[PDB]
Design a protein around this motif. Structure first.
Motif, PDB file in Angstrom:
ATOM      1  N   UNK A   1     -84.254 -55.745  21.584  1.00  0.00           N
ATOM      2  CA  UNK A   1     -84.691 -54.377  21.352  1.00  0.00           C
ATOM      3  C   UNK A   1     -85.610 -54.255  20.143  1.00  0.00           C
ATOM      4  N   UNK A   2     -86.128 -55.373  19.636  1.00  0.00           N
ATOM      5  CA  UNK A   2     -86.940 -55.342  18.424  1.00  0.00           C
ATOM      6  C   UNK A   2     -88.289 -54.671  18.623  1.00  0.00           C
ATOM      7  N   UNK A   3     -88.628 -54.257  19.839  1.00  0.00           N
ATOM      8  CA  UNK A   3     -89.866 -53.532  20.088  1.00  0.00           C
ATOM      9  C   UNK A   3     -89.729 -52.032  19.867  1.00  0.00           C
ATOM     10  N   UNK A   4     -88.544 -51.552  19.484  1.00  0.00           N
ATOM     11  CA  UNK A   4     -88.340 -50.117  19.312  1.00  0.00           C
ATOM     12  C   UNK A   4     -88.905 -49.609  17.991  1.00  0.00           C
ATOM     13  N   UNK A   5     -89.191 -50.496  17.045  1.00  0.00           N
ATOM     14  CA  UNK A   5     -89.623 -50.100  15.709  1.00  0.00           C
ATOM     15  C   UNK A   5     -91.131 -49.896  15.703  1.00  0.00           C
ATOM     16  N   UNK A   6     -91.569 -48.731  15.228  1.00  0.00           N
ATOM     17  CA  UNK A   6     -92.987 -48.423  15.123  1.00  0.00           C
ATOM     18  C   UNK A   6     -93.203 -47.530  13.906  1.00  0.00           C
ATOM     19  N   UNK A   7     -94.455 -47.128  13.698  1.00  0.00           N
ATOM     20  CA  UNK A   7     -94.843 -46.277  12.582  1.00  0.00           C
ATOM     21  C   UNK A   7     -95.357 -44.949  13.118  1.00  0.00           C
ATOM     22  N   UNK A   8     -94.817 -43.847  12.593  1.00  0.00           N
ATOM     23  CA  UNK A   8     -95.162 -42.522  13.063  1.00  0.00           C
ATOM     24  C   UNK A   8     -95.465 -41.577  11.913  1.00  0.00           C
ATOM     25  N   UNK A   9     -95.831 -40.355  12.284  1.00  0.00           N
ATOM     26  CA  UNK A   9     -96.232 -39.328  11.334  1.00  0.00           C
ATOM     27  C   UNK A   9     -95.103 -38.329  11.132  1.00  0.00           C
ATOM     28  N   UNK A  10     -94.859 -37.969   9.876  1.00  0.00           N
ATOM     29  CA  UNK A  10     -93.797 -37.043   9.506  1.00  0.00           C
ATOM     30  C   UNK A  10     -94.419 -35.865   8.774  1.00  0.00           C
ATOM     31  N   UNK A  11     -94.062 -34.654   9.191  1.00  0.00           N
ATOM     32  CA  UNK A  11     -94.569 -33.426   8.596  1.00  0.00           C
ATOM     33  C   UNK A  11     -93.440 -32.689   7.895  1.00  0.00           C
ATOM     34  N   UNK A  12     -93.661 -32.335   6.632  1.00  0.00           N
ATOM     35  CA  UNK A  12     -92.695 -31.582   5.844  1.00  0.00           C
ATOM     36  C   UNK A  12     -93.403 -30.414   5.178  1.00  0.00           C
ATOM     37  N   UNK A  13     -92.838 -29.216   5.321  1.00  0.00           N
ATOM     38  CA  UNK A  13     -93.416 -28.005   4.738  1.00  0.00           C
ATOM     39  C   UNK A  13     -92.285 -27.141   4.192  1.00  0.00           C
ATOM     40  N   UNK A  14     -92.154 -27.110   2.868  1.00  0.00           N
ATOM     41  CA  UNK A  14     -91.124 -26.316   2.236  1.00  0.00           C
ATOM     42  C   UNK A  14     -89.761 -26.982   2.304  1.00  0.00           C
ATOM     43  N   UNK A  15     -88.731 -26.144   2.249  1.00  0.00           N
ATOM     44  CA  UNK A  15     -87.349 -26.590   2.340  1.00  0.00           C
ATOM     45  C   UNK A  15     -86.790 -26.490   3.755  1.00  0.00           C
ATOM     46  N   UNK A  16     -87.649 -26.317   4.761  1.00  0.00           N
ATOM     47  CA  UNK A  16     -87.177 -26.183   6.135  1.00  0.00           C
ATOM     48  C   UNK A  16     -86.735 -27.512   6.736  1.00  0.00           C
ATOM     49  N   UNK A  17     -87.299 -28.628   6.283  1.00  0.00           N
ATOM     50  CA  UNK A  17     -86.877 -29.921   6.768  1.00  0.00           C
ATOM     51  C   UNK A  17     -88.064 -30.773   7.149  1.00  0.00           C
ATOM     52  N   UNK A  18     -87.789 -31.820   7.923  1.00  0.00           N
ATOM     53  CA  UNK A  18     -88.796 -32.785   8.338  1.00  0.00           C
ATOM     54  C   UNK A  18     -88.829 -32.885   9.856  1.00  0.00           C
ATOM     55  N   UNK A  19     -90.033 -33.071  10.402  1.00  0.00           N
ATOM     56  CA  UNK A  19     -90.245 -33.193  11.837  1.00  0.00           C
ATOM     57  C   UNK A  19     -91.208 -34.346  12.083  1.00  0.00           C
ATOM     58  N   UNK A  20     -91.216 -34.836  13.320  1.00  0.00           N
ATOM     59  CA  UNK A  20     -92.088 -35.929  13.714  1.00  0.00           C
ATOM     60  C   UNK A  20     -92.880 -35.531  14.952  1.00  0.00           C
TER      61      UNK A  20
END
Ligand SMILES: Nc1ncnc2c1ncn2[C@@H]1O[C@H](COP(=O)(O)OP(=O)(O)OP(=O)(O)O)[C@@H](O)[C@H]1O
Ligand SMILES: Nc1ncnc2c1ncn2[C@@H]1O[C@H](COP(=O)(O)OP(=O)(O)OP(=O)(O)O)[C@@H](O)[C@H]1O
Ligand SMILES: [Mg+2]
Ligand SMILES: [Zn+2]
Ligand SMILES: [Zn+2]
Lengths: 443, 302, 662
Positions: B79-98
DNA sequence: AAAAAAAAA
């Protein structure tokens, strides 16, 4: 030692004063509206605390009982800051503010609590079976001496984190040749709060195979008291701690209990009107529907096919009549009774459980496993003080609602005569062991 | 980031369970897949009751050490192909999304929201759902995104429930040229009237079929039923290579000849079809007319 | 250091306890134990303990079961050391087990830091009366009945102290669950003074103690039982239940007590039993087929064999034929019993509708028809079984009852017979002779699957998932073929309607049937005569040879098959003939009371559906096929047809032949 | 000392 406490208090003060999303500082306005209505309490949503900073959440999850008083004193500091003018320098009758928490973590069943949940924050659900009478607890004690005869004040919090937590009396006097503890308590000029005990029982459908339900003991104080009535499903957020019983098998045993931090109830203790304006408008709009009768009639047990007049009768029963009173004092009944008397296989019993589920206050009992004394009023005696006291049954538990009785014919002839007055006048009279009380039961 | 289904909004266990790649690689539709998943968890060391908790309240230490845990545990089971690099967006104290979670929420909100007459009504409802998804884009609304996330979870659950039944009943008929599968009856069939929902189901089936020992690359034909209209909604699907393959055997993507075959058969026979979707490989056919049509598709040059 | 096994034969210390803890021999014991549980092969040539470790990892449990006879057959001296001195051996065993478990699962300690090992079945068995002074501080095996259970409370495991006269922090100390830690001179300062616990750095266990009586079937008649106290450490909590007969393997220990000496006038010591393993022995007294704490548990290879044998054609026929291999005929009874003990799937619709998923069976017929033998076999078969009979059961005995605790002096709840039947079968014999008041109290049990009590101010509802199998006899002792069922038995419609399958057994006269039955009975009688490598396995293969001539499959394999099928497989019902079943129900509504007396209601439709689900369960299949529906409809229509007057049985048989055409 | 549940007469 004290510097870390000040740092934590400062961190919480910065959080409460700084937390804003878009263009509103929600918590400051919450404090303003709470103080204006004399409700010295504040509600913290856990997700906001996690999002603001993770270290404070980690510290709160590690040692809750130690950390919480720092937060609950930072709250009152901020309240005195943002409510009272210093005027270049009084009443100041603001006690320590109560902290209430809410969270959306995974639930934990009662039987799954073990030695690894000691002094941790947990969330669980159950059913309320009994409520204790309220009692007093000191918070600021005036202590007076006898020989040296001076004055002192003791400040005590309600969180313990350990069995003792109690500084009874200081050893030696405050500096001639007095006793070990030559102090007394000045009951006047003292401050007291209120505490209550509750018993929780496991939810029936999560009981394991071939087992009996387990009970647990919870303690609440200040504004969390007098909120829940027996027979109400609740969701509790609290701390699973242990306390010793020197009066009371085994060695080094410790009875666990739950300290209530937050309560959620489906009924929301509504039953004067407390509904939101939007909800009131929605109810009026629904009542304006030209065919609400058919909509409600279809809503009664949608999985049952064919019965229509029975469903109309059920709706008319649940809605209920109108109570009346007269100048000379005669009461008039205000409830409707429905009896289902039919052949087997016509889904008589499946309607009873649905009616029990719909009604805000309802109890489901069988005519076979029941007794006349076990329904109206049971006279018990306290094993400790040996005094008669009155314990309610099932009919009094469903006062103001409906009661579901199935297999009405299997009920004993001696038992079935007690309900005659209990329904013809909705009042039951008890004359047992010298107790002469008239008890009310409307259902 | 990882090829996982709503990792930051559902429990890690549910993420591993509903991730399509892990499903294909470990055969989660039978009991041996669940046994291997519990082996995974035991060898990683995460407690099961801990891993069945929300990502917000899940333990900070293992949240920090998750990367190292994966890097040290996932090599044995491929399953070592599951790891990748993605973008994370954070705005304020609402949290993080991808980005992956955002697009899943958008797709689900498109799917679920809110003869010729009912077809027009369905198309109008699809237009209204498009407008609602468009309105949900702005950062001033998040109750229109939490709802999308929960709808995505529900739709993935339904797709998994249907796919396991299809796989166990073995309705996939293997012909000489292309595989065929028809959903004659079952539960919640009214959801699959949406072409994107049908494509999601077909994508999962394609992944499951590709992650097998078979050495045959054949197109897959999928059909559904809507009893009110009495028509079959048929979609043609191309084969896909395993995601863990080199670029040398990627000279050109697999082409789709289904639209050409459909238009040729419609131009040579008087079938009561309606080819109007923008995607040329999705057509509507009659229940009585499906079987001869299929025969023609078998006997025509693909 | 000569760390050889033969060096352990002879002792050098005065006793075993002080010799085991010697540093030289302890490491030899540890290495030999590791070699044992890492290299021991089974009859098939595999390390069974390896599979045990894998299963423990998957289930993340806390107990590893080590078979005693495995330890006795190879390296018997370690078995003797463990049997005579359990405390000094179990610790080394736990350490080596932890190392072995970590070998398969590195970093497993994060889930749990310690593991507890269990002993399967000791060779010697004692009773409560046969306890002496010689067998102290050694393993004992005691059967008994659990009467009063205290509850669950936490205990300290690693106790530390802070002595404030010198600011001395004492190291971690143990606790033996019955003694208080007592230190005299308080470490280096060598004096006594004030101290506190400071329990902010400590770890907790949980315990539960219970009162154990003598089994009524073991005590000599007319005597009184003997009471003892059993202490359960972690992972043993709530395993035992009140009223459930159990068998406990534990350690016998003694301690000082004050008022016992005060009232007896002699230095007498109280005794308690620290439990180590618990095995349930309720109902299923047959304890010779296989060994282990739980006979209803399976390995991975047994699961593979289950799946392999669950795919052959006609497996339902083999399962039906393999039930009660020493009872001749009565194929319909065997099919009904199999369908009743496999059960169906309870249904919950939107959390507001509940559909029962269990099947009830009523047996009616002439005497000498082996109904009681079938009931006894069913009791031996099911995982949970409760046997009642005739006038020997009361209405409040089957149902949960209300009692006052003599100690705390308040009303409480006592588990009834039906509560023990939850997830299981409740067997009743002589159903006709039971009084009506004792008969009308199980309606909710058969239909609502719930027990409601409102007594003495206690209002609570108890769940009950039980399948009731009953046997009775008709009026006059024999069945009148020329009379309707309403004049054959005294039961009414409400009780008759709740039985999914009703069977009637007729004793008739036949020349060759009697001869065949007599031949089978004689062959059975001569087969079970007591007078016809290791001798034990020779006896086991003799048993297998004896059983293979009447049983298509071995009985213990069938036992685990029943358990697995009831545990994991859940059938699903999608492709069923709406019109066929609907018209069949319409036809059974026709005739019936309109022409005869047997009542038919909607419950029988759900009964057909549950039977179809059970037949799906027979094959370990998740989805109902057409053959299962055909078999279910055939069974139901046959049971309905064979309960009519002989005047119209042929007519109805030819009439109803269109739905079960096959 | 007085109320309430259970089995046998
Ligand atoms: N009109 C109906 N529609 C749907 N299901 C029905 C209907 N009537 C009966 N049933 C079914 O009958 C089954 C048994 O019903 P239930 O036990 O509630 O009947 P009852 O009239 O209360 O019986 P009893 O008088 O024997 O206590 C249930 O599974 C229920 O779904
Ligand atoms: N095929 C058979 N059919 C009936 N009885 C058989 C058969 N084979 C052997 N028997 C023997 O017949 C006897 C039947 O048992 P039993 O007398 O308990 O039957 P019953 O009619 O169920 O009894 P009762 O209803 O009086 O309790 C047993 O001793 C059994 O060994
Ligand atoms: Mg009923
Ligand atoms: Zn003084
Ligand atoms: Zn010292």
């Amino acid at each position: 030692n004290d510097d870390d406490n000040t740092e934590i208090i400062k961190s919480f003060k910065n959080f409460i004063l700084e937390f804003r999303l878009d263009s509103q500082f929600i918590y400051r306005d919450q404090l303003r509206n709470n103080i204006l209505v004399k409700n010295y309490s504040l509600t913290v949503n856990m997700e906001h605390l996690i999002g603001y900073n993770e270290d404070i959440y980690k510290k709160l999850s590690d040692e809750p009982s130690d950390i919480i008083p720092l937060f609950e004193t930072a709250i009152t500091q901020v309240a005195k800051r943002i409510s009272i003018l210093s005027r270049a320098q009084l009443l100041n009758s603001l006690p320590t503010f109560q902290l209430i928490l809410n969270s959306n973590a995974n639930q934990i069943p009662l039987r799954d609590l073990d030695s690894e949940h000691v002094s941790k924050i947990v969330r669980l659900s159950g059913i309320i079976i009994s409520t204790s009478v309220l009692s007093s607890r000191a918070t600021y004690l005036s202590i007076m001496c006898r020989n040296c005869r001076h004055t002192t004040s003791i400040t005590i919090n309600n969180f313990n984190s350990i069995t003792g937590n109690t500084v009874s009396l200081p050893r030696s006097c405050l500096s001639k040749n007095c006793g070990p503890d030559p102090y007394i308590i000045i009951h006047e000029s003292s401050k007291f709060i209120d505490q209550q005990f509750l018993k929780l029982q496991e939810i029936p459908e999560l009981v394991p195979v071939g087992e009996m339900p387990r009970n647990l003991t919870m303690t609440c104080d200040r504004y969390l008291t007098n909120k829940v009535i027996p027979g109400t499903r609740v969701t509790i957020v609290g701390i699973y701690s242990i306390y010793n019983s020197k009066n009371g098998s085994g060695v080094a045993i410790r009875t666990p209990y739950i300290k209530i931090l937050g309560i959620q109830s489906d009924v929301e203790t509504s039953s004067v009107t407390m509904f939101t304006e939007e909800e009131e408008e929605e109810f009026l709009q629904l009542s304006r529907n030209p065919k609400l009768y058919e909509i409600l009639t279809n809503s009664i047990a949608p999985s049952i096919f064919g019965n229509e007049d029975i469903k109309k009768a059920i709706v008319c029963l649940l809605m209920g009549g109108s109570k009346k009173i007269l100048p000379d004092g005669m009461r008039l009944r205000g409830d409707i009774n429905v009896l289902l008397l039919g052949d087997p296989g016509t889904a008589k019993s499946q309607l009873l459980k649905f009616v029990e589920k719909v009604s805000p206050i309802a109890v489901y009992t069988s005519g076979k496993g029941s007794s006349a004394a076990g329904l109206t009023a049971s006279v018990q005696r306290d094993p400790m003080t040996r005094e008669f006291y009155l314990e309610g049954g099932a009919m009094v538990l469903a006062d103001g609602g409906v009661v579901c009785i199935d297999e009405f014919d299997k009920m004993r002839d001696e038992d079935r005569v007690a309900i005659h007055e209990a329904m013809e006048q909705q009042t039951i009279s008890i004359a047992k062991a010298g107790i002469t009380t008239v008890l009310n039961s409307r259902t | 980031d990882y090829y996982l289904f709503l990792l930051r909004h559902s429990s890690l266990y549910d993420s591993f369970y509903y991730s399509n790649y892990v499903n294909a690689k470990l055969s989660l539709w039978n009991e041996n897949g669940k046994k291997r998943l519990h082996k995974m968890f035991a060898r990683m060391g995460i407690p099961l009751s801990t891993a069945q908790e929300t990502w917000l309240y899940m333990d900070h230490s293992i949240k920090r050490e998750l990367g190292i845990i994966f890097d040290k545990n996932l090599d044995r089971y491929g399953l070592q192909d599951i790891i990748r690099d993605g973008f994370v967006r954070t705005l304020g104290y609402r949290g993080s999304i991808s980005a992956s979670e955002f697009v899943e929420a958008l797709t689900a909100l498109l799917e679920v929201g809110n003869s010729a007459q009912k077809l027009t009504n369905l198309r109008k409802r699809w237009v209204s759902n498009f407008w609602l998804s468009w309105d949900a884009l702005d950062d001033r609304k998040v109750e229109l995104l939490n709802r999308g996330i929960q709808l995505a979870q529900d739709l993935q659950r339904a797709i998994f429930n249907t796919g396991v039944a299809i796989l166990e009943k073995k309705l996939i008929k293997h012909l000489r040229i292309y595989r065929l599968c028809v959903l004659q009856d079952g539960p919640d069939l009214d959801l699959y009237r949406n072409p994107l929902t049908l494509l999601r189901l077909g994508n999962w089936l394609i992944e499951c079929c590709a992650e097998s020992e078979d050495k045959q690359l054949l197109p897959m034909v999928l059909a559904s039923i809507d009893e009110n209209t009495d028509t079959y909604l048929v979609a043609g699907l191309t084969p896909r290579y395993p995601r863990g393959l080199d670029t040398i055997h990627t000279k050109k993507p697999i082409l789709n000849n289904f639209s050409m075959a459909f238009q040729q058969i419609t131009a040579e026979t008087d079938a009561k079809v309606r080819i109007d979707n923008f995607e040329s490989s999705i057509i509507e056919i009659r229940r009585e007319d499906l079987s001869p049509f299929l025969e023609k598709l078998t006997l025509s040059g693909l | 250091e000569e760390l050889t096994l033969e060096s352990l034969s002879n002792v050098k210390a005065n006793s075993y306890s002080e010799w085991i803890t010697q540093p030289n021999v302890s490491r030899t014991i540890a290495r030999e134990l590791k070699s044992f549980l890492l290299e021991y092969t089974d009859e098939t040539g595999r390390s069974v303990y390896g599979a045990r470790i894998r299963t423990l990892g998957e289930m993340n449990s806390e107990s590893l079961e080590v078979n005693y006879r495995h330890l006795a057959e190879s390296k018997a001296i370690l078995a003797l050391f463990l049997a005579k001195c359990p405390e000094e051996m179990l610790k080394i065993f736990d350490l080596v087990a932890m190392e072995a478990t970590e070998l398969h699962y590195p970093d497993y300690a994060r889930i749990h830091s310690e593991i507890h090992v269990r002993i399967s079945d000791f060779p010697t068995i004692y009773s409560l009366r046969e306890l002496r002074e010689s067998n102290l501080s050694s393993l004992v095996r005691v059967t008994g009945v659990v009467t009063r259970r205290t509850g669950v409370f936490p205990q300290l495991k690693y106790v530390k102290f802070n002595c404030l006269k010198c600011g001395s922090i004492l190291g971690p100390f143990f606790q033996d669950s019955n003694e208080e830690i007592r230190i005299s001179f308080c470490t280096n300062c060598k004096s006594k003074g004030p101290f506190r616990v400071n329990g902010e750095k400590t770890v907790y266990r949980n315990y539960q103690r219970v009162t154990l009586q003598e089994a009524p079937g073991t005590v000599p008649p007319g005597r009184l039982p003997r009471h003892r106290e059993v202490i359960l450490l972690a992972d043993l909590v709530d395993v035992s239940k009140p009223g459930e007969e159990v068998e406990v393997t534990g350690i016998y220990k003694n301690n000082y007590d004050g008022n016992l000496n005060a009232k007896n006038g002699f230095p007498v010591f109280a005794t308690i039993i620290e439990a180590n393993s618990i095995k349930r022995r309720e109902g299923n007294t047959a304890n010779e087929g296989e060994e282990g704490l739980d006979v209803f548990s399976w390995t991975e290879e047994e699961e593979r064999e289950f799946r392999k044998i669950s795919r052959d054609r006609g497996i339902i026929d083999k399962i039906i034929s393999s039930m009660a291999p020493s009872i001749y005929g009565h194929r319909d009874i065997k099919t009904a019993v199999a369908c009743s003990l496999f059960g169906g799937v309870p249904k919950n619709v939107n959390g507001k509708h509940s559909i029962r998923g269990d099947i009830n069976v009523l047996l009616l017929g002439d005497p000498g028809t082996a109904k009681s033998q079938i009931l006894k076999y069913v009791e031996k078969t099911a995982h949970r079984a409760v046997f009642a009979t005739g006038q020997g059961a009361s209405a409040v005995g089957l149902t949960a009852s209300v009692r006052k605790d003599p100690i705390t002096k308040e009303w409480t709840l006592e588990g009834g017979a039906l509560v023990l039947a939850d997830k299981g079968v409740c067997l009743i014999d002589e159903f006709d002779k039971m009084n009506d008041q004792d008969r009308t109290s199980i309606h909710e049990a058969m239909e609502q699957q719930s027990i409601s009590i409102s007594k003495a101010g206690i209002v609570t509802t108890l769940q009950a998932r039980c399948s009731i199998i009953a046997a009775a006899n008709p009026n006059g002792g024999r069945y009148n073929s020329t009379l309707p069922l309403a004049q054959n038995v005294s039961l009414t419609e409400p009780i008759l309607s709740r039985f999914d399958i009703l069977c009637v057994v007729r004793d008739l006269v036949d020349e060759e049937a009697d001869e065949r039955l007599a031949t089978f009975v004689v062959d059975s009688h001569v087969r079970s005569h007591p007078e016809n490598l290791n001798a034990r396995q020779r006896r086991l293969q003799r048993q297998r040879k004896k059983e293979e001539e009447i049983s298509p499959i071995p009985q213990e394999l069938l036992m685990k098959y029943i358990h697995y099928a009831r545990t994991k497989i859940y059938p699903k019902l999608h492709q069923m003939d709406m019109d066929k079943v609907s018209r069949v129900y319409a036809d059974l509504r026709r005739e019936s009371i309109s022409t005869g007396s047997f009542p038919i209601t909607v419950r029988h439709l759900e009964s057909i559906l549950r039977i179809a689900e059970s037949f799906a369960k027979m094959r370990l299949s998740e989805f109902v096929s057409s053959y299962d529906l055909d078999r279910a409809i055939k069974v139901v229509v046959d049971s309905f047809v064979d309960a009519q007057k002989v005047s119209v049985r042929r007519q109805l048989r030819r009439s109803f032949a269109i739905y079960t055409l096959g």
